[PDB]
Enzyme design. Structure first.
Site, PDB file in Angstrom:
ATOM      1  N   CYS A  36      -5.991  -9.871  -3.582  1.00  0.00           N
ATOM      2  CA  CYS A  36      -4.902  -9.655  -4.188  1.00  0.00           C
ATOM      3  C   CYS A  36      -4.236 -10.844  -4.118  1.00  0.00           C
ATOM      4  CB  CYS A  36      -4.300  -8.470  -4.081  1.00  0.00           C
ATOM      5  SG  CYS A  36      -4.887  -6.892  -4.617  1.00  0.00           S
ATOM      6  N   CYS A  41       0.857  -1.209   0.058  1.00  0.00           N
ATOM      7  CA  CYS A  41      -0.123  -0.034  -0.016  1.00  0.00           C
ATOM      8  C   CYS A  41       1.012   1.242   0.013  1.00  0.00           C
ATOM      9  CB  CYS A  41      -0.719  -0.156   1.138  1.00  0.00           C
ATOM     10  SG  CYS A  41      -2.018   1.344   1.308  1.00  0.00           S
TER      11      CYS A  41
HETATM   12  N1  LIG Z   1      -4.649   7.755   6.218  1.00  0.00           N
HETATM   13  C1  LIG Z   1      -5.107   7.784   5.083  1.00  0.00           C
HETATM   14  O1  LIG Z   1      -6.082   8.202   4.559  1.00  0.00           O
HETATM   15  C2  LIG Z   1      -4.140   7.321   3.778  1.00  0.00           C
HETATM   16  C3  LIG Z   1      -4.530   7.320   2.518  1.00  0.00           C
HETATM   17  C4  LIG Z   1      -3.756   6.938   1.763  1.00  0.00           C
HETATM   18  C5  LIG Z   1      -2.567   6.257   2.107  1.00  0.00           C
HETATM   19  N2  LIG Z   1      -2.314   5.794   3.259  1.00  0.00           N
HETATM   20  C6  LIG Z   1      -1.047   5.358   3.428  1.00  0.00           C
HETATM   21  O2  LIG Z   1      -1.599   3.715   3.623  1.00  0.00           O
HETATM   22  C7  LIG Z   1      -0.594   2.972   4.166  1.00  0.00           C
HETATM   23  C8  LIG Z   1      -1.282   2.320   5.747  1.00  0.00           C
HETATM   24  O3  LIG Z   1      -1.570   3.415   6.494  1.00  0.00           O
HETATM   25  P1  LIG Z   1      -2.423   3.079   7.972  1.00  0.00           P
HETATM   26  O4  LIG Z   1      -2.826   4.531   8.471  1.00  0.00           O
HETATM   27  O5  LIG Z   1      -3.333   1.995   7.833  1.00  0.00           O
HETATM   28  O6  LIG Z   1      -1.022   2.990   8.680  1.00  0.00           O
HETATM   29  P2  LIG Z   1      -0.779   3.273  10.514  1.00  0.00           P
HETATM   30  O7  LIG Z   1      -1.918   3.301  11.224  1.00  0.00           O
HETATM   31  O8  LIG Z   1      -0.055   4.713  10.359  1.00  0.00           O
HETATM   32  O9  LIG Z   1       0.240   2.242  10.954  1.00  0.00           O
HETATM   33  C9  LIG Z   1       1.468   2.085  10.179  1.00  0.00           C
HETATM   34  C10 LIG Z   1       2.227   0.711  10.383  1.00  0.00           C
HETATM   35  O10 LIG Z   1       3.324   0.654  10.003  1.00  0.00           O
HETATM   36  C11 LIG Z   1       4.348   0.353  11.307  1.00  0.00           C
HETATM   37  N3  LIG Z   1       5.605   0.901  11.363  1.00  0.00           N
HETATM   38  C12 LIG Z   1       6.022   2.315  11.370  1.00  0.00           C
HETATM   39  N4  LIG Z   1       7.345   2.267  11.341  1.00  0.00           N
HETATM   40  C13 LIG Z   1       7.825   0.842  11.264  1.00  0.00           C
HETATM   41  C14 LIG Z   1       9.004   0.432  11.417  1.00  0.00           C
HETATM   42  N5  LIG Z   1      10.354   1.034  11.312  1.00  0.00           N
HETATM   43  N6  LIG Z   1       9.190  -1.085  11.525  1.00  0.00           N
HETATM   44  C15 LIG Z   1       8.037  -1.842  11.404  1.00  0.00           C
HETATM   45  N7  LIG Z   1       6.822  -1.291  11.522  1.00  0.00           N
HETATM   46  C16 LIG Z   1       6.615   0.114  11.398  1.00  0.00           C
HETATM   47  C17 LIG Z   1       3.498   0.839  12.400  1.00  0.00           C
HETATM   48  O11 LIG Z   1       4.015   0.075  13.594  1.00  0.00           O
HETATM   49  P3  LIG Z   1       3.658   0.743  14.997  1.00  0.00           P
HETATM   50  O12 LIG Z   1       2.616   0.201  15.846  1.00  0.00           O
HETATM   51  O13 LIG Z   1       5.143  -0.051  15.806  1.00  0.00           O
HETATM   52  O14 LIG Z   1       3.965   2.173  15.218  1.00  0.00           O
HETATM   53  C18 LIG Z   1       2.120   0.444  12.025  1.00  0.00           C
HETATM   54  O15 LIG Z   1       1.992  -0.849  12.051  1.00  0.00           O
HETATM   55  C19 LIG Z   1       0.614   4.154   4.819  1.00  0.00           C
HETATM   56  O16 LIG Z   1       1.507   4.020   4.117  1.00  0.00           O
HETATM   57  C20 LIG Z   1      -0.418   5.395   4.661  1.00  0.00           C
HETATM   58  O17 LIG Z   1       0.747   6.586   4.498  1.00  0.00           O
HETATM   59  C21 LIG Z   1      -2.908   6.489   4.114  1.00  0.00           C
END
Ligand SMILES: NC(=O)c1ccc[n+]([C@@H]2O[C@H](COP(=O)([O-])OP(=O)(O)OC[C@H]3O[C@@H](n4cnc5c(N)ncnc54)[C@H](OP(=O)(O)O)[C@@H]3O)[C@@H](O)[C@H]2O)c1
Ligand SMILES: NC(=O)c1ccc[n+]([C@@H]2O[C@H](COP(=O)([O-])OP(=O)(O)OC[C@H]3O[C@@H](n4cnc5c(N)ncnc54)[C@H](OP(=O)(O)O)[C@@H]3O)[C@@H](O)[C@H]2O)c1
Ligand SMILES: O=C(O)c1ccc(-n2nc(-c3ccccc3O)nc2-c2ccccc2O)cc1
EC number: 1.5.1.30
Lengths: 206, 206
Positions: A188, A109
């Site tokens: 997928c 993603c």
């Molecule tokens: N918010 C939106 O509407 C939106 C829209 C489009 C795209 N996105 C993108 O889609 C993707 C999924 O986003 P989300 O909101 O579901 O993610 P999220 O809630 O911010 O969680 C991110 C995940 O990545 C983990 N992580 C961060 N750094 C890490 C590291 N060094 N090593 C291992 N794990 C790590 C985090 O672990 P921890 O719990 O340990 O921190 C968490 O499990 C992201 O890339 C986001 O930018 C978001």
């Protein structure tokens, strides 16, 4: 084509948690990489295997990718506002471990900002978007079977399973439920139809 | 006055200025956060407390929310339709400060476009609407007592107190005066009936 064992990276995130729950309910044998195990819920669906470590640490990624049929990437860096390489450096470690272990399928993603003009990106999201772009390139240049998942806004609407999926472009709707997004990440795994494509899931939640 | 001390974010804005004036006249002890280059006008009503800083700084938001009974959020980008995260990031800082300081009530303005079919939002307003959507999710997921105020066109017609408040849907008129919008923001402080709802204030000025 028979994916049974998957690794999920980012399983503690908002999309990761529901993708993990759905995967477990469907019967996948799920391994997660978490930095601290206490954020995984103690009730409900639980993964089969937990590796404690960092996607920035190649050995932790190797321990997570070993023996898997496919990888789901739902990493994000939460609130980085300025140049950051966590996701693309983690993608490099993921790619290397998938090669060393003969894992050939990755569903990752990034963001629908990769499908829009760069002037649509809010200034304080440019750094993360830049690293999404770096992570996409890493995965596309890997030669692995890569499904690029580029969602619009991630909402909290209930699972519907009736969303739109547009290949190599943006689609008509502009939201996807985290539950529907997790559903598509797993969908997928059951087909090669999206391999080599960018995918945009979106749906009506009137 | 059970709710007496309030923080207003965006007090120097179109709706903010008349919300501030009406709050001071009604006896509220008002704290405002103002950006350094944009203080309140010298002649107008004076708040009880001024914090000079930025909603993008957690420390400035914390100084503004400390010791309040409730928060009103009228942040916005004036005539600027560029991509932004100032409202959603500011709301994240506001939520964290409210939780740390024991403040539960937040009445916050986004836009009636959040009640539209997304394909129908004018493209020129989609970037601002995207940040309203992000802001609304932050506030809805906070668990706070959150009134989501979602107005249609904000006009210059009078204060009436006679406007319609439509719950969880679009209302029968397409305008609300800035003075009536601020009156409604203040009314939301004195009842729990709109908590957890979306509210669309609107009126026919005649
Ligand atoms: N918010 C939106 O509407 C939106 C829209 C489009 C795209 N996105 C993108 O889609 C993707 C999924 O986003 P989300 O909101 O579901 O993610 P999220 O809630 O911010 O969680 C991110 C995940 O990545 C983990 N992580 C961060 N750094 C890490 C590291 N060094 N090593 C291992 N794990 C790590 C985090 O672990 P921890 O719990 O340990 O921190 C968490 O499990 C992201 O890339 C986001 O930018 C978001
Ligand atoms: N018809 C409409 O105009 C309409 C309709 C529906 C919804 N809305 C939305 O209604 C809301 C209120 O609109 P409005 O016209 O009353 O507001 P506005 O005139 O745009 O005023 C915005 C306020 O937010 C402040 N602000 C912006 N960035 C800030 C920052 N970084 N830190 C601290 N304060 C900051 C501004 O301060 P400065 O004085 O320093 O600029 C000003 O006080 C907006 O979110 C708008 O999008 C408008
Ligand atoms: O539900 C309704 O009826 C309804 C919903 C939204 C609007 N908003 N909000 C806006 C607007 C303007 C500035 C900043 C943010 C905004 O959100 N601009 C409009 C607008 C839309 C169409 C025609 C004229 C307009 O002024 C009006 C009515």
């Amino acid at each position: 084509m028979a994916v049974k064992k998957i690794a999920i990276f980012g399983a503690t995130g908002q999309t990761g948690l529901t993708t993990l729950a759905q995967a477990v309910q469907a019967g996948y044998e799920v391994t997660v990489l978490v930095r601290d195990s206490s954020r995984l819920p103690s009730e409900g669906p639980r993964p089969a295997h937990v590796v404690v470590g960092d996607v920035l640490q190649a050995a932790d990624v190797d321990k997570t990718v070993a023996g898997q049929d496919a990888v789901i990437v739902l990493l994000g860096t939460r609130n980085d506002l300025s140049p950051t390489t966590v996701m693309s450096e983690g993608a490099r470690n993921i790619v290397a471990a998938m090669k060393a272990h003969g894992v050939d399928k990755v569903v990752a993603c990034t963001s629908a900002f990769l499908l829009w003009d760069p002037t649509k990106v809010p200034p304080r999201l440019q750094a993360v978007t830049d690293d999404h772009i770096r992570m996409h390139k890493v995965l596309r240049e890997s030669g692995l079977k890569y499904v690029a998942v580029m969602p619009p806004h991630i909402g909290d609407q209930p699972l519907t399973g009736a969303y739109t999926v547009t290949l190599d472009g943006r689609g008509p709707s502009r939201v996807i439920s985290k539950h529907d997004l997790g559903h598509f990440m797993l969908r997928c795994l059951t087909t090669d139809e999206y391999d080599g494509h960018s995918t945009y899931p979106s749906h009506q939640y009137q």
